[PDB]
Design a protein around this ligand. Sequence first.
Ligand SMILES: O=C1N(c2cncc3ccccc23)CC[C@]12CCOc1ccc(Cl)cc12
Ligand SMILES: O=C1N(c2cncc3ccccc23)CC[C@]12CCOc1ccc(Cl)cc12
Ligand SMILES: [Cl-]
Lengths: 305, 297
Amino acid sequence: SGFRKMAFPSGKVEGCMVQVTCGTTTLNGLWLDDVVYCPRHVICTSEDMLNPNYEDLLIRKSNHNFLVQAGNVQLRVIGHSMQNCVLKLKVDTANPKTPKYKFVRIQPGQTFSVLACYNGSPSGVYQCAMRPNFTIKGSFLNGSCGSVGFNIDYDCVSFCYMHHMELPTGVHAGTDLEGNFYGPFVDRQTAQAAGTDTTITVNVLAWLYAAVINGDRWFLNRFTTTLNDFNLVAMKYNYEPLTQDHVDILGPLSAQTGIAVLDMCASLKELLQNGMNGRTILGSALLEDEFTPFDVVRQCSGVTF
Amino acid sequence: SGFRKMAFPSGKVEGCMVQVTCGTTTLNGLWLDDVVYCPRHVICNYEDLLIRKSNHNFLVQAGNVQLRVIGHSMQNCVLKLKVDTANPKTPKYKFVRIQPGQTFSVLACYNGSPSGVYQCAMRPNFTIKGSFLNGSCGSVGFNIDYDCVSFCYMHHMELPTGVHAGTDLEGNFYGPFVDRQTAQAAGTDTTITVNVLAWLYAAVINGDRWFLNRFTTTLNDFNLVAMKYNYEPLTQDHVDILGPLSAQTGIAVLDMCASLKELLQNGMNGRTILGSALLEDEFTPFDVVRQCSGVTF
Ligand SMILES: O=C1N(c2cncc3ccccc23)CC[C@]12CCOc1ccc(Cl)cc12
Ligand SMILES: O=C1N(c2cncc3ccccc23)CC[C@]12CCOc1ccc(Cl)cc12
Ligand SMILES: [Cl-]
């Protein structure tokens, strides 16, 4: 019993964190095999950030301008290349702690663990979700750039995020490990803002199924809805549209609890209209959208209370 | 910017998790140096049950390797299995007993394999609101200070309300609990006042000030209000501990108490604080200072 925002154990990622220094800028890098991956803005000064020409800044650098530190050891850079918004530094030592890994690009609504780091040293781990507006509501201070997001289903680490910047509203933007940004963001200090955010409907439904599995049914009702009528109501509360894909994905949780997806959609509609009336669901007074259907299945018991 | 429920990096603890099997029971053990620590209920009058066991009855598995048990002894509600191999991954560590209100990271484990990490607090009723299934017994709670792991909790059981009970690493239970199947229940719980105040200071640091007001209160008047809303009493030590956050934000502790009193008597009125519609009590003053400064390990 219980339901917590749970992160993956971070040990496999901690053994990959390094500090990358170029001139006066210091940030974090990910050392996998003989390559260190880090945000390309490590080659920039504060002035450069308005309209940096990264190709022009990079051509002026040599291998020995990049200082890479792994623990108390200095790694030697023997090559460098840029791939989108990530810089790849070839080093002369393969990381003996390199886990089994993949680079995966995730979709909005997907969750992942973040290992927040400063000076190549991990400070904390937390769970978060890629918002529908492609930002993440993280906890990052200056010096956290290069900190990574990941999942560890089985013993393979799937790296999905690398931290690059903080937007004016306090939310965060970054790239996959191939350097492609999530959303319409650029690694430039130009006026950029997060788009209007929405609630991840499929995740709220998954969390309502987690509440039923753990023994709570106060929010259920005798009604059902069509998918179209549910979406017309959902859009009015800034909830993401629910697709047939989402309904299919919720199939296993529906079979475990005996509650049809469109019947759970009817409880959600009613919760949006009424609020909670002093009650909580899994210890929360708000509808939680940072647990996916897969996260609920992984954390919750297979036997409904 | 941002404020998340953050756990310590778990790597130093992951390298200590093992699977302990005795007969039909399988649970988790903590391998430090040449000793594996685990709940004594892995055997099932514990001295009578233990005397009937030999070293070879305990199967200990570290990854894909079988460790050989060469001795066994009981210390309170923890069983200590002497093994023939010292853990090469043993970090610098201490066994510490924490107080209610203190927070720690839990590395939830099943079959000696870590599955997740989360942050939690020792409630005033000595239970923890964890996330544990059958097979999680022996999972541990810890903090990290510099390079030293301070182990403070070992999981033993789930109470009927879905909350969890356990011991320190010397086998002493937190709370009036016993390791056996009998009628046991969590006592009435209270809110950790010093932690709610720390979280209100974290909200101010992150730019959330709607709840601030021009008023102040005495510690006595605040405690008369706090006792009415099932909040733990606030002591002069809590006021002293909140001193740094009070100096950083310019809001006196008793000035923040007047804000908390207004929130308790009137609610949030449709508003949130750090994305929450409830008053959060699982961040200590130290957790707020650490997360708003980026301390590393
Ligand atoms: O957002 C940025 N940084 C931060 C990153 N994450 C958290 C932070 C918290 C507090 C202050 C800064 C933070 C560091 C680099 C910067 C600042 C300058 O403007 C840009 C422009 C583009 C890019 Cl890719 C990065 C940046
Ligand atoms: O509470 C217990 N266990 C659990 C532990 N954490 C989570 C759980 C979730 C769901 C079911 C059980 C769970 C496992 C062993 C048990 C149940 C049997 O009787 C006892 C008696 C004493 C002791 Cl110390 C522990 C137990
Ligand atoms: Cl995805």
